[PDB]
mmCIF file as Biopython writes it, N, C-alpha, C and O atoms, coordinates in Angstrom:
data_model
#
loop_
_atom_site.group_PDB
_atom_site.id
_atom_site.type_symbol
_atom_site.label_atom_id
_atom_site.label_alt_id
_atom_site.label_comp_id
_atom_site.label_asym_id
_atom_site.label_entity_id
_atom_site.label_seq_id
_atom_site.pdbx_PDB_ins_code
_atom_site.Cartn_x
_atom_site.Cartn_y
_atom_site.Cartn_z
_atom_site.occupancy
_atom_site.B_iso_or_equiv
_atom_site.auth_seq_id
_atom_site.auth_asym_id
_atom_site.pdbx_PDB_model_num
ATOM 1   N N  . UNK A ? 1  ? -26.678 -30.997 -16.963 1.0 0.0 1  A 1 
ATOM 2   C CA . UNK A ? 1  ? -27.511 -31.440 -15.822 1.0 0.0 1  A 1 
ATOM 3   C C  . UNK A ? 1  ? -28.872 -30.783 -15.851 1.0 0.0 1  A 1 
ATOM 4   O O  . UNK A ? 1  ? -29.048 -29.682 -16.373 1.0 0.0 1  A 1 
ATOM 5   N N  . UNK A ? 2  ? -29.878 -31.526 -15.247 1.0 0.0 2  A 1 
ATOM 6   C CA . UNK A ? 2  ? -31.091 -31.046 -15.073 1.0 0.0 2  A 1 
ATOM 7   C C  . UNK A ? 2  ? -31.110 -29.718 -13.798 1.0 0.0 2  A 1 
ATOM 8   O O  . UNK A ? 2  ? -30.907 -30.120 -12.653 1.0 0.0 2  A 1 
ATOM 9   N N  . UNK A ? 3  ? -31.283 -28.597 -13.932 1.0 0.0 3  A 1 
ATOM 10  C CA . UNK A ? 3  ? -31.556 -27.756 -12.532 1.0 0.0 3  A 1 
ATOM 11  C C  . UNK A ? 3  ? -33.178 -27.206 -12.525 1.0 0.0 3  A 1 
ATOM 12  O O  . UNK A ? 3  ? -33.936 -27.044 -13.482 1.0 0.0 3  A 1 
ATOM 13  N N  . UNK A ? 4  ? -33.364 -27.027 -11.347 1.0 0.0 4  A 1 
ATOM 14  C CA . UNK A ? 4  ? -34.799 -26.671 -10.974 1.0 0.0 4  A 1 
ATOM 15  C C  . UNK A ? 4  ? -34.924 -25.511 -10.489 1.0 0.0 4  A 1 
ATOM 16  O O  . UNK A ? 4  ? -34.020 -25.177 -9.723  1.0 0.0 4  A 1 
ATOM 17  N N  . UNK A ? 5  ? -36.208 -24.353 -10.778 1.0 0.0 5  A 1 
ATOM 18  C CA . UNK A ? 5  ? -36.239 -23.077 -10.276 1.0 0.0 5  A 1 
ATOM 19  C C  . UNK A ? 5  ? -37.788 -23.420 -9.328  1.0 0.0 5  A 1 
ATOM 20  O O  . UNK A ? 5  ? -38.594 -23.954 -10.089 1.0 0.0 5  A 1 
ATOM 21  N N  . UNK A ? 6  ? -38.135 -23.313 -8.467  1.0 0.0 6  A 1 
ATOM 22  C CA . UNK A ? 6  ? -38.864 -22.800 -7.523  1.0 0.0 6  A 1 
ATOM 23  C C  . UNK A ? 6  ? -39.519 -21.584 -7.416  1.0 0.0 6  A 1 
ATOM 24  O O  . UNK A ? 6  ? -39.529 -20.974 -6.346  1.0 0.0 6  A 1 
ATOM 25  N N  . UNK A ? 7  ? -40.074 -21.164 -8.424  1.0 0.0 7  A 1 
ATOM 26  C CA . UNK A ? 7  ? -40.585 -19.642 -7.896  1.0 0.0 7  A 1 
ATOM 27  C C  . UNK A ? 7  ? -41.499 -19.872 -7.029  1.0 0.0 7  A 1 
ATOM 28  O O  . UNK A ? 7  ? -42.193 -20.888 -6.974  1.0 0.0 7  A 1 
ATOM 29  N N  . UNK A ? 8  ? -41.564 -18.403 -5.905  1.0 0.0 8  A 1 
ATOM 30  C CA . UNK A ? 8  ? -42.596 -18.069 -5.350  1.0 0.0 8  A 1 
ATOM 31  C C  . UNK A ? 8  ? -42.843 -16.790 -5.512  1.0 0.0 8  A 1 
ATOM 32  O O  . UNK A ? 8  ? -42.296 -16.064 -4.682  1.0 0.0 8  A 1 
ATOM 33  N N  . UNK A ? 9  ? -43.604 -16.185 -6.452  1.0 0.0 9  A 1 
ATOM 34  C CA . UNK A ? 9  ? -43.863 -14.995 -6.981  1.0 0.0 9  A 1 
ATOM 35  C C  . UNK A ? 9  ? -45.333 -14.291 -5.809  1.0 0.0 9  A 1 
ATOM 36  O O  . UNK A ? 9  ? -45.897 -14.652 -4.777  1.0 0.0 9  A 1 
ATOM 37  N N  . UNK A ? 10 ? -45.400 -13.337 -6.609  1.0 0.0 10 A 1 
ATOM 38  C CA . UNK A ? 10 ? -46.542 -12.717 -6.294  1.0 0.0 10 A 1 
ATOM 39  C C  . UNK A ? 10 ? -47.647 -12.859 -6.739  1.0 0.0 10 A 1 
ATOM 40  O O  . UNK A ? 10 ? -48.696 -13.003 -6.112  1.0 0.0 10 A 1 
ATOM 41  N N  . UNK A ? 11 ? -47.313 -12.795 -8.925  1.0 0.0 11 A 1 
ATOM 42  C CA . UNK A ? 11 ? -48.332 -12.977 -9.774  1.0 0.0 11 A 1 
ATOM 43  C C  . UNK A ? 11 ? -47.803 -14.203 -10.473 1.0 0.0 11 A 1 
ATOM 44  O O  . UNK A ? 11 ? -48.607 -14.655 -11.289 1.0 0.0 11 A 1 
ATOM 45  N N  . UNK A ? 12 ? -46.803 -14.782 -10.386 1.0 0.0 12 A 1 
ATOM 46  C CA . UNK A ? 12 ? -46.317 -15.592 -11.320 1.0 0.0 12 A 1 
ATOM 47  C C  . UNK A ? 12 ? -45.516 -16.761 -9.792  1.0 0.0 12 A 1 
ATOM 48  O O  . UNK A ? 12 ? -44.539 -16.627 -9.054  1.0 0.0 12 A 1 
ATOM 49  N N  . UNK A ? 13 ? -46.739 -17.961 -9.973  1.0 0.0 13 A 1 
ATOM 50  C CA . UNK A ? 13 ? -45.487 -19.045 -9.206  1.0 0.0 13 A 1 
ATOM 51  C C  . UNK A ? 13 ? -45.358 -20.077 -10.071 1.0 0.0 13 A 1 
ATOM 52  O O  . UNK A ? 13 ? -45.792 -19.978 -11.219 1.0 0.0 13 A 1 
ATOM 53  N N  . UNK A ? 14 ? -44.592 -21.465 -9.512  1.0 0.0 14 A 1 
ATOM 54  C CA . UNK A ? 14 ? -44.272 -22.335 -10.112 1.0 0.0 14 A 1 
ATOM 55  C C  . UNK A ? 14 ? -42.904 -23.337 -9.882  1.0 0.0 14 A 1 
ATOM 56  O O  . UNK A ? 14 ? -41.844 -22.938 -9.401  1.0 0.0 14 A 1 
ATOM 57  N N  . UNK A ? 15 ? -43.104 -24.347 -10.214 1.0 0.0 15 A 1 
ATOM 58  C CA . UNK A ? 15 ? -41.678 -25.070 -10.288 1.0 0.0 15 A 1 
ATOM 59  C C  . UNK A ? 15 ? -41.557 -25.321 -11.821 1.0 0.0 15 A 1 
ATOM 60  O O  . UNK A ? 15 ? -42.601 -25.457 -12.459 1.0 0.0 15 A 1 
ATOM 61  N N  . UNK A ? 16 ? -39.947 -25.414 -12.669 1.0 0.0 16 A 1 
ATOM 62  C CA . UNK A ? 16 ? -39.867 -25.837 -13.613 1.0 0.0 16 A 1 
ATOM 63  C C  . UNK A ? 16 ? -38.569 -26.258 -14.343 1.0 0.0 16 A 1 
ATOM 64  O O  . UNK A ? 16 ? -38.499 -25.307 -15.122 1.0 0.0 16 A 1 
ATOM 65  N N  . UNK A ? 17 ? -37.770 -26.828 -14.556 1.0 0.0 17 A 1 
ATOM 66  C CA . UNK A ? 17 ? -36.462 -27.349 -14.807 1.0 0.0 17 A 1 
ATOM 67  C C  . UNK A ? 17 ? -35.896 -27.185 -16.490 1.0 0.0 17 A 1 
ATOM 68  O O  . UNK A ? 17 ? -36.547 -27.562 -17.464 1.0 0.0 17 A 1 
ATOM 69  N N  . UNK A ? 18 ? -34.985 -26.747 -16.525 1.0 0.0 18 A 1 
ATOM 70  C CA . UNK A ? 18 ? -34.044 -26.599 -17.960 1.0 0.0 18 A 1 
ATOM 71  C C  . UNK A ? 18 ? -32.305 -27.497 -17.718 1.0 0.0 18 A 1 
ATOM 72  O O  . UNK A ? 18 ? -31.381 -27.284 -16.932 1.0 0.0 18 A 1 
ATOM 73  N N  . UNK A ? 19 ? -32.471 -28.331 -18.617 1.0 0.0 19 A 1 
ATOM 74  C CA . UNK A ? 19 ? -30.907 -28.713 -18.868 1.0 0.0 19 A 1 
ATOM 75  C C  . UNK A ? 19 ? -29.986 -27.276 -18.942 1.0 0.0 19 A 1 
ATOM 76  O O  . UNK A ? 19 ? -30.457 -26.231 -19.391 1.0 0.0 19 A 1 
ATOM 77  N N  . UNK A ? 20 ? -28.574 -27.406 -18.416 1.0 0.0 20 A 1 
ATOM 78  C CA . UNK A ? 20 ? -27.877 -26.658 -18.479 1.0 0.0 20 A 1 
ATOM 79  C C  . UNK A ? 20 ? -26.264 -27.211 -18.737 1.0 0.0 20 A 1 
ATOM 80  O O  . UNK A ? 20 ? -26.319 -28.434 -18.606 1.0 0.0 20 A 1 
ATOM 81  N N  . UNK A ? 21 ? -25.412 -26.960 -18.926 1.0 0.0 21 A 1 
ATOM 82  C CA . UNK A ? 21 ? -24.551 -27.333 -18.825 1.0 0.0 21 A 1 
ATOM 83  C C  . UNK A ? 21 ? -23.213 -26.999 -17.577 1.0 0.0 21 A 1 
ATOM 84  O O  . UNK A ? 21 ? -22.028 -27.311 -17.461 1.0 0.0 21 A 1 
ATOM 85  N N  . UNK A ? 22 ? -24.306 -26.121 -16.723 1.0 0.0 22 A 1 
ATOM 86  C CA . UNK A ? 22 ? -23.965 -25.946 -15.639 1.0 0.0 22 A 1 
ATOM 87  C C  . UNK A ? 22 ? -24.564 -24.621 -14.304 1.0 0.0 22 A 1 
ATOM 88  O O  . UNK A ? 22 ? -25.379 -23.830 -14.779 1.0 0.0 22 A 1 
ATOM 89  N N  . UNK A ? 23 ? -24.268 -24.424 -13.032 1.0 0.0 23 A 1 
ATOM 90  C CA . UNK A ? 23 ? -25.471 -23.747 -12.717 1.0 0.0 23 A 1 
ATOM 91  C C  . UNK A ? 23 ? -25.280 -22.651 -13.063 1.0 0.0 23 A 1 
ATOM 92  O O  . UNK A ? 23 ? -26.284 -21.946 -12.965 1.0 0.0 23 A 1 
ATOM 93  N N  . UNK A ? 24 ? -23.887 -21.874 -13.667 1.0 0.0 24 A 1 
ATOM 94  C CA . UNK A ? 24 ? -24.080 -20.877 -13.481 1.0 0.0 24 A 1 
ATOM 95  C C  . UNK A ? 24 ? -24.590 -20.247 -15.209 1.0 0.0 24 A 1 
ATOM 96  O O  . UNK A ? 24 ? -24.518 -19.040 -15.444 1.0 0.0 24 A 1 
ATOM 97  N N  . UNK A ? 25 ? -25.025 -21.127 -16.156 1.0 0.0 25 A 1 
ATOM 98  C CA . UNK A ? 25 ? -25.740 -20.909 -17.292 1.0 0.0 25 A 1 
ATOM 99  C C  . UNK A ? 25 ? -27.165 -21.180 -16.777 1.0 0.0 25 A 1 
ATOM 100 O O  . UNK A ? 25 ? -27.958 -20.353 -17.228 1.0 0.0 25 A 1 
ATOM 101 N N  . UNK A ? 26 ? -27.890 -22.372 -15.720 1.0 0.0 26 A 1 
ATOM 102 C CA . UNK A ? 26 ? -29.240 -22.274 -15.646 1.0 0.0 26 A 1 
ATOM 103 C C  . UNK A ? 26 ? -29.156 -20.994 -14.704 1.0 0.0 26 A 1 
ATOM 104 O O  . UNK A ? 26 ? -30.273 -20.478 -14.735 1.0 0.0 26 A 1 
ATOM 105 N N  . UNK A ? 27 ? -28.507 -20.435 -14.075 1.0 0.0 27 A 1 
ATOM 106 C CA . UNK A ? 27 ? -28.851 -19.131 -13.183 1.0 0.0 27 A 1 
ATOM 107 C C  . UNK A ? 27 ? -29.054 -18.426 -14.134 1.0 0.0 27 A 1 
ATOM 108 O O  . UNK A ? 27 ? -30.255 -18.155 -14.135 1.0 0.0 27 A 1 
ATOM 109 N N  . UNK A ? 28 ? -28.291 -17.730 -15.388 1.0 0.0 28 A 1 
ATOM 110 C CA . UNK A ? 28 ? -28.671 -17.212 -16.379 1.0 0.0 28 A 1 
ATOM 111 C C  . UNK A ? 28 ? -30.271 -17.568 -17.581 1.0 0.0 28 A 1 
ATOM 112 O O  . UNK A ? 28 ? -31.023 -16.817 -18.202 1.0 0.0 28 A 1 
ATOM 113 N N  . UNK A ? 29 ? -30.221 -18.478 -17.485 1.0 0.0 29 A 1 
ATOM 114 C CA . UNK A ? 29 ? -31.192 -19.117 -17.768 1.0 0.0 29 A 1 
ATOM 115 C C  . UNK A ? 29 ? -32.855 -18.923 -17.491 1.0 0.0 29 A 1 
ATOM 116 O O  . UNK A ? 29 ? -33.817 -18.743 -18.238 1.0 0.0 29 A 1 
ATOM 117 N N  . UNK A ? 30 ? -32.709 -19.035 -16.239 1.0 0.0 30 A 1 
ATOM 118 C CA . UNK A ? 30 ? -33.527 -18.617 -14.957 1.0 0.0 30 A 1 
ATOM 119 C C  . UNK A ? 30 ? -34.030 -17.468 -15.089 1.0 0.0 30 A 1 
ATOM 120 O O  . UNK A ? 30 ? -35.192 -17.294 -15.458 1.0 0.0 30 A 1 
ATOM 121 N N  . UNK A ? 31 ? -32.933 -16.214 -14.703 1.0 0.0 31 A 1 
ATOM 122 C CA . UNK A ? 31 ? -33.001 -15.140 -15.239 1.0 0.0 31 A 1 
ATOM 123 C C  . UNK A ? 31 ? -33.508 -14.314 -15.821 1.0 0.0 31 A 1 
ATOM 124 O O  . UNK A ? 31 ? -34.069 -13.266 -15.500 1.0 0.0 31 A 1 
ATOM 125 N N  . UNK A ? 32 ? -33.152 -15.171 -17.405 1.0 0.0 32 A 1 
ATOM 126 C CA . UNK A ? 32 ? -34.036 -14.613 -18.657 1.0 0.0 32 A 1 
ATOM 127 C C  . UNK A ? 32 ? -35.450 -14.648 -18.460 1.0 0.0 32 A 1 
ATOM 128 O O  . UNK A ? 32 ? -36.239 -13.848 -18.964 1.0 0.0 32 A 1 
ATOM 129 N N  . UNK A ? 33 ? -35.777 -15.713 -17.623 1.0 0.0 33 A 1 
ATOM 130 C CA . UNK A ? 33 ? -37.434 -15.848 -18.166 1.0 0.0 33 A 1 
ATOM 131 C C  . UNK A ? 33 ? -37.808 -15.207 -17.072 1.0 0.0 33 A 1 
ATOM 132 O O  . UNK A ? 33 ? -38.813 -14.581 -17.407 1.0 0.0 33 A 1 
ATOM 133 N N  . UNK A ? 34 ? -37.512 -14.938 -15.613 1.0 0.0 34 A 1 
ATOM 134 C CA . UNK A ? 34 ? -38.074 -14.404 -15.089 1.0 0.0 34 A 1 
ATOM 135 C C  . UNK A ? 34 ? -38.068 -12.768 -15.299 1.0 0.0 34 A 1 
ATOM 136 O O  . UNK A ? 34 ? -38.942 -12.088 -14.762 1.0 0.0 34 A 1 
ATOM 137 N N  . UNK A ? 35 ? -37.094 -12.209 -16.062 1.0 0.0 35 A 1 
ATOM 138 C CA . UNK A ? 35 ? -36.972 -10.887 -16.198 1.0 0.0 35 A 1 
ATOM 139 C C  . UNK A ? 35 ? -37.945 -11.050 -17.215 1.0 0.0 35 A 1 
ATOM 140 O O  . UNK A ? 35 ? -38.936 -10.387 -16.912 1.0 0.0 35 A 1 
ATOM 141 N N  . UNK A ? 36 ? -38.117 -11.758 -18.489 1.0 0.0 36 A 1 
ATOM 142 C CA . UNK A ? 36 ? -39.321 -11.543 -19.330 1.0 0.0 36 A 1 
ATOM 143 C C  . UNK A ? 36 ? -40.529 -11.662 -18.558 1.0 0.0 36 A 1 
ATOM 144 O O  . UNK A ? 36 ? -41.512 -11.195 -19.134 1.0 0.0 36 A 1 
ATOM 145 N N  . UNK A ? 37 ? -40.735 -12.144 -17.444 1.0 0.0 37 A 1 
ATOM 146 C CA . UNK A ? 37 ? -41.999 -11.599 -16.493 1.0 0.0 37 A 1 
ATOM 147 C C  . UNK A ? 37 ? -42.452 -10.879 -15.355 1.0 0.0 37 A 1 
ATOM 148 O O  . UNK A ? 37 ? -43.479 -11.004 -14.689 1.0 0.0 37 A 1 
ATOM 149 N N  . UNK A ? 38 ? -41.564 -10.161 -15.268 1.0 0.0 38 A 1 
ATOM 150 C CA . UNK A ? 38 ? -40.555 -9.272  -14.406 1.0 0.0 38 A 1 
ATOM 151 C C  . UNK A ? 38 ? -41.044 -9.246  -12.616 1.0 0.0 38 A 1 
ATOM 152 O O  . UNK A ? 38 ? -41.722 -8.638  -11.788 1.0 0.0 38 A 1 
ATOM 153 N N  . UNK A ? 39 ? -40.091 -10.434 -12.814 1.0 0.0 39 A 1 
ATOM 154 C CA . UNK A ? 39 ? -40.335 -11.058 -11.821 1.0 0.0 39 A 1 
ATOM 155 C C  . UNK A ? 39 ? -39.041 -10.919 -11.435 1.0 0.0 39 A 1 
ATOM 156 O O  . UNK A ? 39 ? -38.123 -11.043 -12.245 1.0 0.0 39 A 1 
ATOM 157 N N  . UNK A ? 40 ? -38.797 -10.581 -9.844  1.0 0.0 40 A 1 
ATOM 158 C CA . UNK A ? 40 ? -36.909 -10.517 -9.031  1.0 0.0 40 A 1 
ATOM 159 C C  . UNK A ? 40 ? -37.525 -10.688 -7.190  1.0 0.0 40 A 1 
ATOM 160 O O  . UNK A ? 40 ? -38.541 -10.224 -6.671  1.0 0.0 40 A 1 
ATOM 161 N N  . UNK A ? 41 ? -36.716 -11.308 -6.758  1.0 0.0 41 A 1 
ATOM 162 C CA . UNK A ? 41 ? -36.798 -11.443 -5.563  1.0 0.0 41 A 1 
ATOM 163 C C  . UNK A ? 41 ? -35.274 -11.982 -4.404  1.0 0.0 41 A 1 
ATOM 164 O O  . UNK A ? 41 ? -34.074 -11.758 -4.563  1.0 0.0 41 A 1 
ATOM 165 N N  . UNK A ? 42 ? -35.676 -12.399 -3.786  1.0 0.0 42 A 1 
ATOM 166 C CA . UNK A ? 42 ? -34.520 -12.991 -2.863  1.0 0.0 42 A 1 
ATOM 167 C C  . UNK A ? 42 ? -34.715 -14.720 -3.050  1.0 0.0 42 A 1 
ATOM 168 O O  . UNK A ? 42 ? -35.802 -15.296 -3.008  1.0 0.0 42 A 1 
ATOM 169 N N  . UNK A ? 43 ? -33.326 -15.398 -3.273  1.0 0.0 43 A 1 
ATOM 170 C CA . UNK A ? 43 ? -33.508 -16.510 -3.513  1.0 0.0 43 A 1 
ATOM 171 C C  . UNK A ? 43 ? -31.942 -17.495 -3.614  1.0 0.0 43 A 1 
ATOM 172 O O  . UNK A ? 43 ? -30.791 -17.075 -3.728  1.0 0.0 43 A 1 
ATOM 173 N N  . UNK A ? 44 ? -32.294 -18.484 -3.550  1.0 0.0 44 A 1 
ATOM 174 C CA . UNK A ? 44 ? -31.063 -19.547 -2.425  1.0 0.0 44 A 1 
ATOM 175 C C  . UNK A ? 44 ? -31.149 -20.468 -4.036  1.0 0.0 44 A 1 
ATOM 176 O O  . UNK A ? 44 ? -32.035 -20.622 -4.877  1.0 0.0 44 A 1 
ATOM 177 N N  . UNK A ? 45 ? -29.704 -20.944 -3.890  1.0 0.0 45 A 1 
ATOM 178 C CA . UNK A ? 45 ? -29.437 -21.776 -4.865  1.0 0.0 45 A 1 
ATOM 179 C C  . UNK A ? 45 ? -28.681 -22.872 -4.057  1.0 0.0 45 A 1 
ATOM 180 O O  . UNK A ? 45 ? -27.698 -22.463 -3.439  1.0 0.0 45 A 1 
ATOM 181 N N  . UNK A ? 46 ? -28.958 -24.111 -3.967  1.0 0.0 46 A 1 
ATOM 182 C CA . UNK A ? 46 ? -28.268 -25.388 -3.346  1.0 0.0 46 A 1 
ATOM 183 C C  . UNK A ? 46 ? -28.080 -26.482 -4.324  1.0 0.0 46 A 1 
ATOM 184 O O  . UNK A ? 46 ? -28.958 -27.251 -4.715  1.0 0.0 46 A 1 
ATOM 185 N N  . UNK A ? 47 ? -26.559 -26.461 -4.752  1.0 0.0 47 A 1 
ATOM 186 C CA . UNK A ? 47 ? -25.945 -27.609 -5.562  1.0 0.0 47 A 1 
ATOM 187 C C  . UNK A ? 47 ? -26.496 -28.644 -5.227  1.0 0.0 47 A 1 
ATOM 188 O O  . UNK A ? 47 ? -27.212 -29.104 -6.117  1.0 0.0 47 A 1 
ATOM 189 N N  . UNK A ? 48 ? -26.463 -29.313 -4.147  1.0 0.0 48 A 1 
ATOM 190 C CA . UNK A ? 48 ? -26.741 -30.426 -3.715  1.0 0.0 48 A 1 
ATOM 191 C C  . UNK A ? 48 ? -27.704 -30.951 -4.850  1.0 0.0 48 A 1 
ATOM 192 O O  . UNK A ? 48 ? -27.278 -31.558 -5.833  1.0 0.0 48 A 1 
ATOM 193 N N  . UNK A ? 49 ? -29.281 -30.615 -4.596  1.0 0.0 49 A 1 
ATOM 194 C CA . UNK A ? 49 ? -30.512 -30.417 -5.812  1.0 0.0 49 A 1 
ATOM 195 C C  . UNK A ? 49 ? -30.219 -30.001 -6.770  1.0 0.0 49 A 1 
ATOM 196 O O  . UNK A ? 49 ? -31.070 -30.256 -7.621  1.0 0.0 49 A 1 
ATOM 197 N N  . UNK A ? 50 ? -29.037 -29.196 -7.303  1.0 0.0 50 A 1 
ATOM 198 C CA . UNK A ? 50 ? -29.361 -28.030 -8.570  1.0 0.0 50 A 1 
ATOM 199 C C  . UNK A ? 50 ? -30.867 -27.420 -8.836  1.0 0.0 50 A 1 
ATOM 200 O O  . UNK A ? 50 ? -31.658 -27.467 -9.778  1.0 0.0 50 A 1 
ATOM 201 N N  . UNK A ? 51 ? -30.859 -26.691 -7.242  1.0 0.0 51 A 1 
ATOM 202 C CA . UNK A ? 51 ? -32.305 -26.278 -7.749  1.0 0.0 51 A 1 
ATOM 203 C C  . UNK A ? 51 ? -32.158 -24.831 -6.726  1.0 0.0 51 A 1 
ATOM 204 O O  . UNK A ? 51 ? -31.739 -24.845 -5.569  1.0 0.0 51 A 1 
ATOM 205 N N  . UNK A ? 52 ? -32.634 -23.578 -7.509  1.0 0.0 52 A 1 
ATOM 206 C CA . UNK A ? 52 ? -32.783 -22.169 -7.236  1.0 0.0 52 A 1 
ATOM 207 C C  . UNK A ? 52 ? -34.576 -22.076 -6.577  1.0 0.0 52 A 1 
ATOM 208 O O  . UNK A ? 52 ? -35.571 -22.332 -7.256  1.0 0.0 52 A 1 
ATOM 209 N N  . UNK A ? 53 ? -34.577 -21.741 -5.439  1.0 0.0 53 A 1 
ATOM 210 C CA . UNK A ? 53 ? -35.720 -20.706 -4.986  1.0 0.0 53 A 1 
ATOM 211 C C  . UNK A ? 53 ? -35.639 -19.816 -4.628  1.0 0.0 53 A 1 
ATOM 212 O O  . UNK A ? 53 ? -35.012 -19.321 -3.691  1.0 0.0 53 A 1 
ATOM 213 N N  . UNK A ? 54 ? -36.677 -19.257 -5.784  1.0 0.0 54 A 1 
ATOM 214 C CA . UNK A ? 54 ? -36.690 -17.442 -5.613  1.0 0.0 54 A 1 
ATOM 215 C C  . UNK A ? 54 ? -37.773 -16.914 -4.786  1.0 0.0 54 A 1 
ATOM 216 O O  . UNK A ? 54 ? -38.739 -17.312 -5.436  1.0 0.0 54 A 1 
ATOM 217 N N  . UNK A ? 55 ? -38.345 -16.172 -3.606  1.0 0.0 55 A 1 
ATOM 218 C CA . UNK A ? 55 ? -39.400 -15.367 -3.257  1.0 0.0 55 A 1 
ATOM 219 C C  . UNK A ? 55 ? -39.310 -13.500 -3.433  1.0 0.0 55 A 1 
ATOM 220 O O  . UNK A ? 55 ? -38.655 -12.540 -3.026  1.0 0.0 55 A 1 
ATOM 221 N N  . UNK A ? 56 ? -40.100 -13.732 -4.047  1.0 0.0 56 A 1 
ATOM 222 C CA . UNK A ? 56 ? -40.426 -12.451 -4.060  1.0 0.0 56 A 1 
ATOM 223 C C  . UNK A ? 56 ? -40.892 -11.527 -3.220  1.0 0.0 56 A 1 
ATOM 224 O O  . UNK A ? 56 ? -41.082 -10.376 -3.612  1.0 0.0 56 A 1 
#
């Protein structure tokens, strides 16, 4: 499935979507790239969308 991340960063925002084969690989997914920009915050994940927003 297609899932969607929502950032709302500080230095880094954006929306942007990765196939997954499910959410709890795009949560991992997700993850990765935001820790490569070290980026962490508080953030809601709703199946409904398959889509994660994070604020920082």
């Amino acid at each position: 499935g297609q899932y969607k991340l929502i950032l709302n960063g500080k230095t880094l925002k954006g929306e942007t979507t990765t196939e997954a084969v499910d959410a709890a690989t795009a949560e991992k997914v997700f993850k990765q790239y935001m820790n490569d920009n070290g980026v962490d915050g508080e953030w809601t994940y709703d199946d409904a969308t398959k889509t994660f927003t994070v604020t920082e």
